[PDB]
Design an enzyme around this catalytic site. Sequence first.
Site, short mmCIF file in Angstrom:
data_model
loop_
_atom_site.label_atom_id
_atom_site.label_comp_id
_atom_site.label_asym_id
_atom_site.label_seq_id
_atom_site.Cartn_x
_atom_site.Cartn_y
_atom_site.Cartn_z
N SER A 177 46.21 22.71 47.61
CA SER A 177 47.66 22.76 47.45
C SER A 177 48.35 22.16 48.68
O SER A 177 47.84 22.22 49.80
CB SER A 177 48.10 24.22 47.25
OG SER A 177 49.52 24.37 47.21
N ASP A 223 36.42 32.57 32.14
CA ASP A 223 36.40 32.64 33.60
C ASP A 223 36.06 31.27 34.19
O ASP A 223 34.88 30.90 34.26
CB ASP A 223 35.40 33.71 34.04
CG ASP A 223 35.31 33.85 35.55
OD1 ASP A 223 36.17 33.26 36.24
OD2 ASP A 223 34.37 34.56 36.04
C1 KCE Z 1 36.19 39.19 39.86
C2 KCE Z 1 36.15 38.12 38.77
C3 KCE Z 1 35.01 38.41 37.77
C4 KCE Z 1 35.28 39.65 36.94
C5 KCE Z 1 36.15 39.59 35.86
C6 KCE Z 1 36.53 40.74 35.19
C7 KCE Z 1 36.05 41.99 35.58
C8 KCE Z 1 36.54 43.27 34.89
C9 KCE Z 1 36.42 43.16 33.37
C10 KCE Z 1 35.72 44.49 35.34
C11 KCE Z 1 38.01 43.50 35.25
C12 KCE Z 1 35.15 42.04 36.64
C13 KCE Z 1 34.77 40.88 37.30
C14 KCE Z 1 36.14 36.69 39.35
N1 KCE Z 1 36.02 35.69 38.27
N2 KCE Z 1 36.06 34.37 38.77
C15 KCE Z 1 35.14 36.50 40.47
N3 KCE Z 1 33.84 36.56 40.30
N4 KCE Z 1 33.29 36.38 41.52
N5 KCE Z 1 34.21 36.21 42.42
N6 KCE Z 1 35.39 36.28 41.76
C16 KCE Z 1 36.64 36.09 42.51
C17 KCE Z 1 37.07 37.34 43.25
C18 KCE Z 1 36.38 37.76 44.39
C19 KCE Z 1 36.73 38.93 45.05
C20 KCE Z 1 37.78 39.67 44.54
C21 KCE Z 1 38.47 39.26 43.43
C22 KCE Z 1 38.14 38.10 42.77
O1 KCE Z 1 39.44 40.18 43.11
C23 KCE Z 1 39.36 41.19 44.12
O2 KCE Z 1 38.29 40.86 45.00
#
Ligand code: KCE
Length: 330
Positions: A199, A35
Site C-alpha cells: 500500500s 481464505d
Molecule cells: C486466522 C485465519 C484462519 C482461520 C479462519 C477462521 C477461523 C475460525 C472459523 C475459528 C473463526 C480460524 C482460523 C487466517 N486466514 N488467512 C490466518 N491463518 N493463518 N494466519 N492467519 C492470519 C492471522 C494471524 C494471526 C491472527 C489473525 C489472523 O487474527 C488474529 O491473530
Amino acid sequence: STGSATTTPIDSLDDAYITPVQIGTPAQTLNLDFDTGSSDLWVFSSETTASEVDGQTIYTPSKSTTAKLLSGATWSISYGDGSSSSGDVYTDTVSVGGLTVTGQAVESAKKVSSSFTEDSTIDGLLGLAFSTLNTVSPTQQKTFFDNAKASLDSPVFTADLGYHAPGTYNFGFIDTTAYTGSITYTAVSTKQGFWEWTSTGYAVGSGTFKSTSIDGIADTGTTLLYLPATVVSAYWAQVSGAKSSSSVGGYVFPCSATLPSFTFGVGSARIVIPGDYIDFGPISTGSSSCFGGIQSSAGIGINIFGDVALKAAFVVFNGATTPTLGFASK
Ligand SMILES: C[C@H](Cc1ccc(C(C)(C)C)cc1)[C@H](NN)c1nnnn1Cc1ccc2c(c1)OCO2
C-alpha cells in the site's frame, strides 16, 4: 468456463463469511470459509472426532461414488490465530457457483481445535493463496483455483464482500457492473505464498494523506485490518476515550462513539473504509466498551488487509503468469 457464488456473513458483526460448495456425487453441499491467506481445502467429515462436531454439516466420502482415498496422504495446519486441524485426504469432484474441478484434493478432518467446533456455521475452509503453502504430505496438492485456472475464460477470481450484507466470489471473469471507476492494479510478491502487496499510504477521517509504504497481505480469511502500531495509534487518537487494553487484547472504544473513516492507498488510487465498518461491538455481552476493527500487527509479524479493508473494495486476484492484485471502489 466461469463460476459465481454468493458469500454471506456468519453473524451480525461480519465475523467471517461462508460460501456454499458442492462436493461429491451426489452433491454434498458444505458452507466453507474462502481464505486467500491459506492453501488447504479441508472439511468437517464422518471421520471427525465426534465430540469435536457441534452443529456443522459433514462430508461423508463413503456416500460419494466419485471419492477416492489419496493413499498415504495426511495434512496438518496451525493457523496464526492459534486454531488448528488435521486428517487424511480424498480426491473428489468439487463445484463452486457452477464451476467444476474433478480430482480436487478434499482434506477430511480427523481433529479440529475448539475454535472450529464452537463455530457451527463454518463447515471447513477453502484456501485461495498459492499452492506452495498446501500442507498435504508426502505429495503436496493444488488449490481449487490452481486446478481450475487453465479452463477459466480469464485466469482470475474476484472478491466482493458485503458490509452486514451478502456479496460475491466470481471465478474466470470480471463483472464490470460490480464496481465504480477503474480497477487499479499493483504488484504482488509470491515469495511467502501469499497475495502480498505494498500500500502507498493512509488517511484518518478527513485528514491529509500520509505517503508511506505498507507491505501486507490481501486475506479474506482474517476478519480485521492489522497495521503497524504507528498507523493504528494515529487512527484511535481521533476517537474520544479509545485505549489499548492488554486484558481485552487490543484497542477498545466507547460504544457511544461515531468512528472516523480510514483510507488506504493503492498506487495513486484511494479506498475509503467507512467508520461503521470498524465497529465490532461490545467486548462482552451488555458492555459499553466496543472492540475496534483496526488493530496492531506488532504481535503477528505481518500486516494483514483482512475483511474490514477488503469489504470496502472490489478486489481482483489476477493469476496471470506474473500475478497482480486489482482494487476498485464500489
Ligand atoms: C486466522 C485465519 C484462519 C482461520 C479462519 C477462521 C477461523 C475460525 C472459523 C475459528 C473463526 C480460524 C482460523 C487466517 N486466514 N488467512 C490466518 N491463518 N493463518 N494466519 N492467519 C492470519 C492471522 C494471524 C494471526 C491472527 C489473525 C489472523 O487474527 C488474529 O491473530
